[PDB]
Design a protein around this ligand. Structure first.
Ligand code: CL
Ligand code: CL
Ligand code: CL
Ligand code: CL
Ligand code: CL
Ligand code: CL
Ligand code: CL
Ligand code: NA
Ligand code: TB
Length: 129
């Protein structure tokens, strides 16, 4: 599923991401834009052999199992394919565990380099939330 911007914002809000660990909804929409372009089916292989999955490009090195990232963990206790569903529940629950780690949203490289410090509220502008 390729979400609309406000559509994704509404879904993220409903699942309790808005202001989670202090990160406003626009930060999460911005992260999703530059991680996956709002496409739940997005996958990208990392140089180390891990793969990033879904709307928030969650990495198999630590967070989900894809059976082909030797020596990795599965801290969200979920198959990585579950992060490609049209229903973002799984991606949101896992993202909550990721951002609760010491580095907050800096764990998302695209957030740090393209969202951090910018006018992220623009990403929810005009949305009927
Ligand atoms: Cl957009
Ligand atoms: Cl915001
Ligand atoms: Cl990740
Ligand atoms: Cl594995
Ligand atoms: Cl292993
Ligand atoms: Cl959803
Ligand atoms: Cl933080
Ligand atoms: Na893994
Ligand atoms: Tb950690």
């Amino acid at each position: 599923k390729v979400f609309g911007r406000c559509e994704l914002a509404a879904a993220m809000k409903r699942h309790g991401l808005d202001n989670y660990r202090g990160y406003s909804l626009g930060n999460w929409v911005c992260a999703a834009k530059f991680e996956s372009n709002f496409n739940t089916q997005a996958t990208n292989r990392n140089t180390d052999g891990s793969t990033d999955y879904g709307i928030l490009q969650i990495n198999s090195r630590w967070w989900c199992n894809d059976g082909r990232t030797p020596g990795s963990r599965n801290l969200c206790n979920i198959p990585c394919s579950a992060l490609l569903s049209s229903d973002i529940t799984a991606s949101v629950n896992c993202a909550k565990k990721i951002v609760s780690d010491g580095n907050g949203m800096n764990a998302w490289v695209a957030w740090r380099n393209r969202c951090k410090g910018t006018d992220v509220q623009a990403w929810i502008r005009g949305c009927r939330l």
